[PDB]
Ligand SMILES: C[C@H]([C@H](C(=O)Nc1cc([C@@H](CC(=O)O)C2CC2)ccc1Cl)c1ccc(Cl)cc1)C(F)(F)F
């Protein structure tokens with residue numbers, strides 16, 4: 154993934170648990186070489202997987218929980234690190250933001266040539282409900298989408314309840330989320 158992801162994890166861990174913990178997570182990840190992450194630089198996906206696995210050990214939390222928390226932190230963090238305007242352009246309500254996802258990724262992919270964006274398909278099901286189909290080149294990140302949705306809820310001051318209705322883990326073609334909202 155691009156450095157920005159890893160920076161965000163470092164920053165989420167650092168603010169919530171201080172620096173020496175970061176550094177131990179870092180060493181346990183096998184990442185002592187690497188001095189700092191470069192935001193626009195492509196890294197191997199394992200750097201991120203190993204960061205998450207190592208934070209899970211050091212902090213005594215499932216990787217999945219850490220992933221939910223990352224998903225919550227990620228929109229706010231990117232909005233403050235140079236992507237504020239861009240996220241603002243993707244809309245003024247949660248459902249408008251969902252529908253703009255693909256066009257947002259098209260714009261992001263101008264600046265990040267090797268972006269592998271996930272596929273998001275949104276069905277507006279009832280008035281306070283949506284169904285979100287999620288397909289990724291990466292495995293295991295459904296809990297992050299959950300947290301991200303919560304983050305979007307907060308962004309647009311909209312109450313959100315999210316339930317995963319289908320899991321790739323059980324052998325379904327893709328992750329599906331039912332989303333109920335304010
Ligand atoms: C709003 C965000 C959207 C984003 O995070 N997109 C995204 C997500 C991933 C996931 C994993 C994956 O499924 O491959 C990696 C972050 C771990 C990889 C590639 C991309 Cl382009 C987004 C956020 C900020 C900005 Cl600045 C632009 C886009 C979402 F996910 F909800 F769509």
Ligand SMILES: [Cl-]
Pocket residue numbers: 154155267268269270
């Ligand atoms: Cl990517």
